[PDB]
Every structure is written in structure tokens, then in C-alpha cells.
Amino acid sequence: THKISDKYVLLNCDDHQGLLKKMGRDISEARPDITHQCLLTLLDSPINKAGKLQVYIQTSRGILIEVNPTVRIPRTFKRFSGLMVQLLHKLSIRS
Amino acid sequence: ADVDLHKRAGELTQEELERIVQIMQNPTHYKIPAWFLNHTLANNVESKLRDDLERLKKIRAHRGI
Amino acid sequence: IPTHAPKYEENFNPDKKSYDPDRTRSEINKMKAQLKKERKFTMKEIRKDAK
Amino acid sequence: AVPSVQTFGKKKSATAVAHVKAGKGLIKVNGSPITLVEPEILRFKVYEPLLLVGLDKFSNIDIRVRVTGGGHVSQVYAIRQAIAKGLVAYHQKYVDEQSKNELKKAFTSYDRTLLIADSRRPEPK
Amino acid sequence: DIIKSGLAEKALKALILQCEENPSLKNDKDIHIIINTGKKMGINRDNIPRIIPLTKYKLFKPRDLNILLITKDPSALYRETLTKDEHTSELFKEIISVKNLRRRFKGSKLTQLYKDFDLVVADYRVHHLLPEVLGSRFYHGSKKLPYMIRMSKEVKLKRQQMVEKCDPIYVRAQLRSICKNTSYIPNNDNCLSVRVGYIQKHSIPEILQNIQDTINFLTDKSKRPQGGVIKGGIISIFVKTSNSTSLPIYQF
Amino acid sequence: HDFAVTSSTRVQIFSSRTRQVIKTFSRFKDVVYSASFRSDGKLLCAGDATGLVSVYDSYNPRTILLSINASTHPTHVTKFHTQDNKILATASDDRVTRLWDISNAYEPQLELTGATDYVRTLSFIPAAPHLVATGSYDGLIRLYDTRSSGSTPI
Amino acid sequence: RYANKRFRKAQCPIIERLTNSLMMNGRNNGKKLKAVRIIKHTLDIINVLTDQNPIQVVVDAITNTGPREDTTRVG
Amino acid sequence: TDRFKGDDDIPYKERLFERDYYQQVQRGKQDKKISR
Amino acid sequence: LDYVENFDSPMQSALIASSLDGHVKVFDPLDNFQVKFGWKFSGPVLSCAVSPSTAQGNRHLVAGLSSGLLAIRTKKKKSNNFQRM
Amino acid sequence: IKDMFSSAMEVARFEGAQIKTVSGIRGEIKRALSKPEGHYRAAFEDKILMSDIVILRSW
RNA sequence: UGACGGAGCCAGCGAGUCUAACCUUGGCCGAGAGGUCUUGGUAAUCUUGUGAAACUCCGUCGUGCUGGGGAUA
């Protein structure tokens, strides 16, 4: 997450030019879309539907998230970003 | 209502269940002892207290934050 | 597997408080925090100039 | 004119005075018998000075223990220490010394906190 | 002697029609008379509520009010032989002894207890040591003040100990008498307040008849245990609810 | 000196000094079918109409010692071995009786199949403790040596 | 007193070491009579499920469970 | 129960924005006190 | 069915059987399983038992009917100076 | 001390003052109490009695 | 590692003629000062000594949390 001056954004690769370089990191890393497309794959695969799978995702900052199988992940990207910000800042997301 | 104290709720005769409903439905007629069965003020006094506190700051020599 | 949807507020700010839909608990809680911080600040100021 | 022997047992703040005299065989704690010592899962902590050496030692003496202070487990520990060192002291005084230090060997081989309490603590590391 | 007249009825009508409207007294539901006597009744206020017997109007039924029973030391005999008897099996809301009563209810729990029950009835043996157990809330005034009951119908003689038994028809009997009749507590001065009637359970002629009942019983020559207390000339009555003024009756 | 009576959804241990219920087991979830004491009398098995053989200890109805999830049909007869003390025979409306070990109550130590209709009775042979005489609704008192395979009566 | 020298706890009796390890959480620190009571109950039902010595059962449980190698994270 | 149906949208904040003996005797005792 | 053995009885061993018709009957497996006594209850007798061979006390026979009720029948079982003188 | 002030703001204004009873027992206002509004804690020379009146002379 | 409801039983500190509420409804006496009596509500870590709580034992129940203005008794 980043505070923007009154806004909290998930650090995408495209919502900025140089927020990552004003913090220090490189543009070839700020990739939340690929954990989005992996959440889509694991949460639409039939083994999740039969309930023989659980997902844990973990960040480059070592922040471990347990992803339940029953979650209806938002299929578009910016809903996912706005959801992931409240995940990182409320520590829990309700049904 | 004379129904068994240890029967379950499925095993009930219909006269016994309607006897339960009757006993609940007219309780004072059945001489049941009647002991068996039984907002903005904060907002307005709080605005007066914040009025009081504003007056108390301004009679002294204060500032906000 | 049953499929529930995740409850969240879009355009979040964790420092800002959430939207309780009532205006007679949210506003009295706002003026609770206002009354507490202004009371503590005022009487701290007057006890330090009393010292 | 009667033989009598008084000993003391102590744990954390419990105290237990045992009077041993020549009698019929009756063991009493606070007036009630020894088989009514609570909390009843430490009744064998009270019973072990008896069963360690056999009830034929006790069959001619009669002990009585007055216990005061402490909590439940402090009281059963002061009771068993009072019973043990009272029986040893009666056997030193009015029965023979051979039996006295046989009883001392039995109680010390089980645990010598039946006879010597841990008294002064702590350590400055 | 007999006092029942149009001034008394006028006062009670006016007070009823005042309490059915007056918003500062929308909670008090009780009619009390204030007997003003001339001479000072000399007997000191111990807090034993003596019973004024009414003749033809039971003013409270013993089943539509919460009853707390305070018993002797072990309370096992009283609790079982009260609760599993079917004569008194549904009569008492709570039966607790003095020991665990003062274990459980202390402090603000006593205000909750006072707001919880509506008739405090205690054993006559342990009644006298209630005022430090129960607090000052029960004894400031008299509306939840505890009543004595005997439980055994056995007298105590010297040199021999009372056998312990309780009698549930007797406890129902005197609790029926307690909720049936009304009660007064004497004092040293001239004033004396008695609750007679209710606000909507009772009507004006029955309240007047039991008022006159209490006048007879307090001014009487006989009943020198309980009722011979107005030994001189009674001067006035007033009538009030718990937060009203005092509407005067029988100005002598 | 006690006898366990199976009514529906409660098992009542009566005593034989006063003939009244001393103890009662109420916490079943369907109709309870079988109730039997172990050979030593230390514990009690009860077969249920959901296939959940609950074994309590006798003379304490509050400690469910274990609960075997047997077959999905109603288990109808449950009893411990008469010679052994740690195997429990439960037969159900699955046409198969089972010898569970009450240490390993996840899989049965023998699964006596071979029946064609609604096994309702067990017995054990009182001297040879390998021999289980089961009985079903097609006549045919089948009986099994347990040292062998167990899917075929001898 | 089994915690004032280095290896003296190696001869506290093994039922007591099991009891002392049983009474540790945030909830039941110090409740040794509760832990003694539940060790008494669990030895009763070990004997009633497996007709053998529950002291032999707990001795065997120690000797089976205690590992024989392990990895330390190298610097 | 969602089979690629996803979670639904939520409406906007501005979408939720744009949418007598008594009285005689009590005055008698009052005037009695004031008379004294 | 059930069966008792060597209990205190003239019948050395007994097999009693319960048969859905009110009747529960006892057969003696020594003289070729002949019937010897029987009881009749008020419904279909669904299960029966008797107290076992080492009961040593009050000896019981219980039969539980399909009607919802149960029947139990039982058979039941100066001074030291003066004495020293 | 019960009522010589009406609120914690007044006691905060008058913290640290010297008070005394009518029996000459000196003392000093230590801290405004929290729960009742005009009450405070004072520390005296020795144990004052319930029958006394504390006093703050001011001009 | 629950929820009710009883029973059992165990301390150590602490002894200044000192220790401690408030707001009311009314009656009478008194010149007033005030006294006494009566009454309802709010607050309460009880009041100086006896005693604890956790604990032990016994009966009953039985393990997916919560809201106000709308709707039916």
C-alpha cells in the first residue's frame, strides 16, 4: 500500500511512473496482476470446487495471507486492488 | 400440561402440543404466577459540553492544535 | 464449494473511520472523540500554566 | 506419667503439630480422622508415612495433628512431615533406637522432605 | 369512629385524575395514607412490619409479584421442601440463605436486587441481621422492607433444641396473609404512612373501605400486640402517591 | 445387578435393588438400537439409527468414551466380545458385520461380509473365541472363523 | 526441587513430567491439581481401552515420540 | 452461489446521497408557608 | 432369546424366548428343550432378559414390549460383665 | 475532599495550593479526582477527621 | 479448559473516642434557627477481624457470535 496526497493504492506497475523509484524499487517487480491471475486460476479450477485445495499467498514483504476456497474473488483488476488494500490494512475481510 | 418432561419435541401427541400452545396463550386465566413471564440526550448535552469547553478555552488564552 | 462474496468498502482509508449508517451513533461518537481530546488538552494546558 | 512426643511440620506457611502418645491406634487430623483429609487427591501424600513403614508401627501409638495456615497442598505437606518426624521421634524416645533409625532410613529413602523441610530461600544469581 | 365521606372521595378522585396525567409522577402506582396523630406513640422503630388485617379486599394476590425468600444457615431443607411440594413450588421467585446472599449480592448488585424483587420475606430467626446484609436501600423508607415468616409452627422452649422442619402450607398461608393484608411500621413521632390499595387494581369504594379498616385497626383498644398504637386522638389523614402532594382527609 | 433398556433415543440403566432408573443416556441423534455392557461391565456400547456406535462407560453417562462412525445405514446390533475385551462387533443395515478394535476406532479389524439381507444378530462361540455366529433376514446363520479372510463364512 | 541443577530434571518421575508439561497455557498456569486429575482420568481410560499398564503405555509413548535426529539452521 | 457471476457491484456513495381540589390544596399549603 | 446356566434353580439351565404375541416361555435344555413355564403380557413382547448366573441378589425377569412399556418380575431373597459371667 | 469546587477544570486551576482544616492541620491539594466532578485528593499533616472543614484562603 | 444450581474447605498482611453517600415526596412541633417522623429515586470497592478467590465434589444442559426506525400476532 501507499498513501497518496488521502488515497491508498496498491502499488501497481501502471498507476504511476515513479512511485516505485521514489521509494527505491524497480518497475520490473511491482506485479500484483500476476497474483491476480493466479488467484483466478486456483479459484476457478475444479479442485477448488471439490474442496481439495487451500491457497496461501505471501508477499515480498513476508506478509502471509490465508485465502479460503469459498472466496468469490473480483474478476476485474481494480476491484481486486481496492480489496487487497483493505486486506492489508484491516487484516481480515468478511463475507 | 402433563406432557412428559423427557420426551423429545418430535415425539409429541397433537393434543399435548396444542395444550402447550393453549397454556402459553391464556396464561393469566390458567392462574400461572405472573412473575413467570415478563437517545439524543447524549447528543444535546454533549453539544452543550463542547460549547462549555469552547467558552472555557476562550476565556483563557488558548489555541487549537 | 459454497461461494460467498467478500464485504469491503471501495476507496478505503484505514485511518478514516468506516461508515456506520446511523447518524445518531456516528455523530455522538465523533463528538465523544472531540470532547475527550479537547477536554484533555484544555485541562492539561491550564494545569501546566498553574504550575 | 504417660509417654508423649510433640513434633512440628511446616511448608510455605502451613504448620502442623503432631502429638504422639501410647495408645490404641487412632490417627486424627484437626479432630477428624486421617481418612478425611482434603483435597482427596493428596490424601496419599498424607498416607505415605503410614504405608511406607506399615501400619504395625502405628498400631500402638495414636497421633493427633493440628494444622493451621497455608493452603490445601501446603497443609497436606505439613501434615505428612509432622506424621513422619513424630513417628521417628516416638521411636527414638520410647521404643528402641534400632527401630528409630530403620524408620529414618525408610523415610529418607523415600524422600527426606518427610523429615527435613527446605527452610531458607532464595539465591542471588 | 367511622370516616367515609365526600371529602375523602373527592380527594381520592382528584388524586387519581391527577396521577393519570401528571408527567412527573408517571411511575408511582400506590396509594398511601398519612395518619397524623396527636400524642406521640412511644414505641421505637424496629423494622418489623406489622400486618394490618383487611376484611374483604385482598389487595395483592401472592402470585403476580416477585418474592425473595431469605432462610436460615443450611437452607437445604427449606429449599427442597419448598420447591418440590406443588403447594409452594411456584410461589417464590428466589430462595437464598443469608450466608450466600451476602456472598453474592454486594454493592450495585443490591440496587439490582432491589429493582429485581417486589416482596422480601425472611425467616424470623435471620431477619434481624438483614440490615447490613441487604443494605440501606431496603430500609430507607418502607416499600421492599422484609417481612418475618415462621416456617415451622413449632415453638422454641429452653433446654431443648428446635427440630428442623418446614411446612409449605404454612408458608403459603402466611405469605397469602402478607400479600392479602396491608402492613405498617411504627415510630416515635406522630406521622405514620400506610400503603392501602393500588393505582389501577383497585377502585375508589374498595380503597375507602380498606382505608376505614386500617383506621379502625390502628385506633382500636384491643389488638394490643399489633393494632393498639393510636392510644390518643387521631387528628388527620392525608392521601398521596409516592411523589404527590398530600390530599387531606378527616381534619378532625 | 443392573440392566440397560433401549427405548427410543435414550438408554436407561435400571438397578436390581430398587427396580428404578438409576442412570440414563439421552444424547443420541436418532433412534438408539442396541445397548450392551462389556464382558467386565466397565463400559457400554450403543448402536444408533445413524450408524454411530457410541460407547460410554457404564455408571457415568457423561463421558462418551469413543464414538465409532460405522456404516451409513442404521447399525442395529453392537456387542463386545465375550472372551476378548477390546473388540466390538457392530452389524448394520449394510449386510456386513464388523469387528472393531476399540483402540483403533477408524478402521475395523475385520469386516465380516458375505450376507444377502439385513444382518440383525451377533453371537460369539463361548469357548472358541475366533468364531462369530451372525444371523440375517434370509435364514442362514452364517458363522466365521476370524483367522481366515472373513468375507466367506466357514 | 528438580530445576536447580542441570540434569536433575532427568529423574523427576515421568508421570510428573507429563503433568507439569500438561499444565501450561495462558489459561491453566499453576493448576497442578487439575493436571493431576486429568492425568488420573486419562490413565484410567488408557487402561480401559487397552488392557495393559498405562504407565507402560506412557513410557512407550515417550520412547516412540522422542526424535533421534534434527536439523539446525546453519549460519 | 456464483458460477463466473462474480461478486455484485456496490452502489456509489453519491448514489446513496442522491436518492382542581389538588391545585387548591397545594396552593393552600404554599400560601400557608408564605404566610408564616 | 437368552439363556442362564447353573443358577440357583431346579432347572439346571434355562432358555427363555420372547415371541411377539404376549408370551415369553422358558425351555429346559436338559430334557430336550421342553417348555416349563410362561408369562403373558399386554402386547407384542419385543425383547426379554433375565438376571445372569451370578446375580447373587434380587433375581429379575424383564420383558420390554413393542407397545412402549416394560414389565419386571422379581424373586426376592447384653453387656460385657454379663457376657463374661 | 468533597465540594469546594464544581469541576475538574476548577481543581486543575487550583492544584498544588495549600489548604488546612479548622484544626490547624495543614495540607495541600494533590490531584483532581476523576469520577465525581468537583472532588479532589489532598494530603494533610496527619489524619484529619470527618467532622472538619478544609479551607483555602485566597484574595 | 463452557453454562447454570448446591455442598465442602484452606491464608497472610491490616486496630488514632476512629470509617465516611447524594437528590427528593410530605406530616407535626417551633417566633425563627432548626428538630423529629414519613417517603421515592440515583450511586455503592460495604461498614474493623468471621471470611477469600482459584480449588475439590455433586445434578442439569450441550457446543457455526451479533442491530435499530419498517412488516404479522
From Swiss-Prot, chain E:
Query: What is one process in the GO biological process aspect for this record?
Result: maturation of SSU-rRNA
Keyword Metal-binding belongs to the record: no
GO-annotated cellular components: 90S preribosome; nucleolus; nucleus; small-subunit processome
The organism's superkingdom is given as Eukaryota
Q: What is its main location?
A: nucleus
Alphabetical list of SUPFAM superfamilies matching this protein: Ribosomal protein L1 (SSF56808)
Q: How does it assemble?
A: Component of the 90S pre-ribosomes. Interacts with FAF1.
Q: Which family does it belong to?
A: Belongs to the universal ribosomal protein uL1 family. Highly divergent.
Q: Which protein is depicted?
A: Ribosome biogenesis protein UTP30
Curated annotation (Swiss-Prot), chain F:
Q: Where are the WD repeats?
A: 1-26, 27-66, 72-110, 114-154
Disulfide bond sites: none
Q: Which organism is it from?
A: Saccharomyces cerevisiae (strain ATCC 204508 / S288c) (Baker's yeast)
Q: What is this protein called?
A: U3 small nucleolar RNA-associated protein 15
The subunit field of the Swiss-Prot or TrEMBL record says: Interacts with snoRNA U3. Interacts with MPP10. Component of the ribosomal small subunit (SSU) processome composed of at least 40 protein subunits and snoRNA U3. In the absence of snoRNA3, forms a complex with other t-UTPs. This complex can associate with pre-18S ribosomal RNAs.
Compartmental location:
Nucleus, Nucleolus
Q: What else is known?
A: Present with 358 molecules/cell in log phase SD medium.
Q: What does this protein do?
A: Involved in nucleolar processing of pre-18S ribosomal RNA. Required for optimal pre-ribosomal RNA transcription by RNA polymerase I together with a subset of U3 proteins required for transcription (t-UTPs).
Superkingdom to which the source organism belongs: Eukaryota
UniProtKB/Swiss-Prot annotation, chain H:
Transmembrane regions listed in the UniProt entry: none
Name the domain of life: Eukaryota
Q: How does it assemble?
A: Interacts with snoRNA U3. Interacts with MPP10. Component of the ribosomal small subunit (SSU) processome composed of at least 40 protein subunits and snoRNA U3.
Of which family is this protein a member? Belongs to the SAS10 family.
Q: What does this protein do?
A: Primarily required at the G2/M phase. Essential for viability: involved in nucleolar processing of pre-18S ribosomal RNA as part of the ribosomal small subunit (SSU) processome.
Q: What else is known?
A: When overexpressed, has a role in the structure of silenced chromatin. Overproduction causes derepression of gene expression at both HML and HMR, as well as at the rDNA locus and at telomeres.
Tell me what this protein is called: Something about silencing protein 10
What is the species listed in this Swiss-Prot or TrEMBL entry? Saccharomyces cerevisiae (strain ATCC 204508 / S288c) (Baker's yeast)
Swiss-Prot record, chain J:
Q: What is its subcellular localisation?
A: Cytoplasm; Nucleus, Nucleolus
**Signal sequence extent:** none
Briefly state the protein's biological role.
GTPase required for synthesis of 40S ribosomal subunits and for processing the 35S pre-rRNA at sites A0, A1, and A2. Controls access of pre-ribosomal RNA intermediates to RCL1 during ribosome biogenesis by binding of RCL1 in a GTP-dependent manner and, via its affinity to U3 snoRNA, delivering it to pre-ribosomes. GTP-binding and/or GTP hydrolysis may induce conformational rearrangements within the BMS1-RCL1 complex allowing the interaction of RCL1 with its RNA substrate. Required for RCL1 import into the nucleus.
Q: How does it assemble?
A: Interacts directly with RCL1 and the U3 snoRNA to form a stable subcomplex. Component of the 90S small subunit processome also known as 90S pre-ribosome that consists of the 35S pre-rRNA, early-associating ribosomal proteins most of which are part of the small ribosomal subunit, the U3 snoRNA and associated proteins.
The entry assigns this protein to a family as follows: Belongs to the TRAFAC class translation factor GTPase superfamily. Bms1-like GTPase family. BMS1 subfamily.
Record's protein name: Ribosome biogenesis protein BMS1
Organism taxonomic ancestry = Eukaryota, Fungi, Dikarya, Ascomycota, Saccharomycotina
